[PDB]
Amino acid sequence: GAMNSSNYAELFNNDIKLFVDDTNVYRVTVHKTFEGNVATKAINGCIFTLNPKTGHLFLKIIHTSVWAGQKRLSQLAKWKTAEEVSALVRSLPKEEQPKQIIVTRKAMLDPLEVHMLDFPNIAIRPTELRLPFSAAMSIDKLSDVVMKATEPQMVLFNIYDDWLDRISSYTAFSRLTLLLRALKTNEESAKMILLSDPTITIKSYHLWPSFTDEQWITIESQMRDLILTEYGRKYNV
Amino acid sequence: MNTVPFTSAPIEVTIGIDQYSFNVKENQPFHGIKDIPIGHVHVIHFQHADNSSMRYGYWFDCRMGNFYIQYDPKDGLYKMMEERDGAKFENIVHNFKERQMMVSYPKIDEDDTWYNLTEFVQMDKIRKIVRKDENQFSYVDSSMTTVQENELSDPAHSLNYTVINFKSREAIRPGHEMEDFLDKSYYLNTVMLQGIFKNSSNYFGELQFAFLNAMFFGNYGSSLQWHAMIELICSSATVPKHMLDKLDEILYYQIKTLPEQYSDILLNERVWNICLYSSFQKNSLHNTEKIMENKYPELL
Numbered sequence: 333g334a335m336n337s338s339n340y341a342e343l344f345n346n347d348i349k350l351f352v353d354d355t356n357v358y359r360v361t362v363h364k365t366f367e368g369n370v371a372t373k374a375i376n377g378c379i380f381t382l383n384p385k386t387g388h389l390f391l392k393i394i395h396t397s398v399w400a401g402q403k404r405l406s407q408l409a410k411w412k413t414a415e416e417v418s419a420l421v422r423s424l425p426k427e428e429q430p431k432q433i434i435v436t437r438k439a440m441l442d443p444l445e446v447h448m449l450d451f452p453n454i455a456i457r458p459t460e461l462r463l464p465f466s467a468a469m470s471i472d473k474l475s476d477v478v479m480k481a482t483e484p485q486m487v488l489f490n491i492y493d494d495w496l497d498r499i500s501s502y503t504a505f506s507r508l509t510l511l512l513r514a515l516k517t518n519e520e521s522a523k524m525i526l527l528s529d530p531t532i533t534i535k536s537y538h539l540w541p542s543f544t545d546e547q548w549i550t551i552e553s554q555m556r557d558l559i560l561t562e563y564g565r566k567y568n569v
Numbered sequence: 570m571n572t573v574p575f576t577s578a579p580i581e582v583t584i585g586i587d588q589y590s591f592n593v594k595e596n597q598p599f600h601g602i603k604d605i606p607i608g609h610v611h612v613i614h615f616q617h618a619d620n621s622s623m624r625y626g627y628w629f630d631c632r633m634g635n636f637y638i639q640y641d642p643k644d645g646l647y648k649m650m651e652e653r654d655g656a657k658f659e660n661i662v663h664n665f666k667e668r669q670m671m672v673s674y675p676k677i678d679e680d681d682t683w684y685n686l687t688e689f690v691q692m693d694k695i696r697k698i699v700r701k702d703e704n705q706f707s708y709v710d711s712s713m714t715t716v717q718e719n720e721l722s723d724p725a726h727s728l729n730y731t732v733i734n735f736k737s738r739e740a741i742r743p744g745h746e747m748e749d750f751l752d753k754s755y756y757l758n759t760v761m762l763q764g765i766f767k768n769s770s771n772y773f774g775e776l777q778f779a780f781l782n783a784m785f786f787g788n789y790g791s792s793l794q795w796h797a798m799i800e801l802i803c804s805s806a807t808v809p810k811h812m813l814d815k816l817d818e819i820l821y822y823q824i825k826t827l828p829e830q831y832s833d834i835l836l837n838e839r840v841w842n843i844c845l846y847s848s849f850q851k852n853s854l855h856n857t858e859k860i861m862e863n864k865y866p867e868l869l
């Protein structure tokens with residue numbers, strides 16, 4: 333059934349599973365027309381499909397041409413997401429197909445379920461967690477490749493860089509969500525925090541800085557502080 | 570006009586014949602039902618004074634033979650049976666009438682309710698849903714489950730309605746995933762009407778028979794099935810004009826006939842609000858919509 337705080341440790345067993353997030357699939361600036369009406373202009377989007385155990389991220393870039401001459405785009409975006417996920421699954425070898433696909437938003441169950449009818453033994457699950465994957469675009473390396481795209485394109489990343497060489501997937505996923513929640517709540521402060529020290533570089537094949545174990549602790553501390561501050565501002569607590 | 574005799578009434582029971590129902594006392598001299606109108610199916614059903622669980626009954630068509638009722642004290646229920654000796658059967662019926670031990674099927678001349686509920690219901694189709702081929706008549710009860718219900722346990726006692734599943738390969742063409750899920754006209758017209766049911770009359774008959782079993786026996790899977798077939802039309806953007814007009818009439822008399830106190834379990838809020846207000850056919854059920862609003866505005 334639904335994924336929540338209790339069964340959280342199942343993300344990290346050896347049953348292959350994928351998180352799918354569709355928040356940045358269909359993206360628009362809203363602007364005024366010459367006549368004073370409101371109109372939208374789409375930009376390139378993406379499907380964020382993540383193995384929480386390995387860090388393998390499958391970034392399906394959704395080029396704006398896909399919406400051309402279509403109506404009800406927000407609804408179609410959901411079906412497009414399920415078509416692209418389902419084709420990812422078909423594309424993978426059998427022993428690599430997921431046993432479970434957990435969607436971040438419940439409106440994707442029916443689309444994915446319909447597209448996955450050929451895979452009856454793959455379970456499509458909702459989640460009660462409020463995961464911050466929509467901040468995946470605050471990530472310049474990903475933002476940049478999305479925006480530059482001239483056609484549809486799959487790009488493969490490890491969203492945990494080399495972290496698993498030193499820490500467990502549980503801990504890596506917790507760091508990842510803490511970084512993304514901070515990016516979501518206050519992007520400016522969050523990116524200030526990671527580059528504060530110009531001597532800590534980003535490897536070309538990495539989207540996080542090469543912190544030592546000790547600097548990650550300090551980093552994670554600073555991100556927790558940031559989130560908590562923002563929250564008091566939000567509610568006046 | 571045909572007759573169904575009863576050998577005896579040994580236990581206290583409420584007896585229904587179509588939408589009429591009489592209370593019968595333990596060992597009251599009740600010997601059957603007369604003036605039953607020829608030309609429609611019918612249903613005779615029972616609810617024992619002592620066990621208000623398990624409504625049970627028999628569907629039948631008197632053109633298909635002479636039928637009577639007889640209590641069985643071993644199995645504890647009023648059983649339907651066929652009498653093959655024509656002379657022996659007229660003789661029984663005539664003697665009972667002479668003694669006036671029979672109630673009269675109480676039809677009002679102005680009244681087309683029964684016709685309107687059973688328009689497309691045909692005894693041969695019923696006998697394919699309730700497969701018991703040594704009998705010309707069909708038993709149903711509260712507790713029988715549907716073939717689809719069993720898929721998610723005894724086959725001989727199941728109700729073999731046509732399986733409808735909006736999220737199946739059957740309903741969903743590969744490559745038209747979004748299209749067919751949002752607009753079931755493919756599934757309705759090609760798969761169900763043309764492929765399985767063959768015509769709208771058979772579809773409509775199954776729908777009417779589902780409804781009547783949900784209403785008379787409280788058979789829940791029959792209720793699921795009725796709602797499913799309404800939902801399949803209502804969610805199709807392309808439906809023959811004649812079918813839409815006929816559905817409004819069908820549902821109208823179904824909603825008219827439902828006992829007021831049962832709207833809570835027998836009517837599926839989600840299906841009706843979607844059909845009447847969200848679906849492609851939201852504007853095609855004017856009489857159904859008008860009666861639902863003036864009689865059950867709460868559900869909506």
Ligand SMILES: O=S(=O)(NCc1ccco1)c1ccccc1F
Nearest residue numbers: 471472473523526527534538539
């Ligand atoms: O693509 S990024 O991860 N986005 C922003 C960010 C915040 C902290 C570090 O990075 C990146 C930014 C700046 C220098 C290198 C990078 F890999």
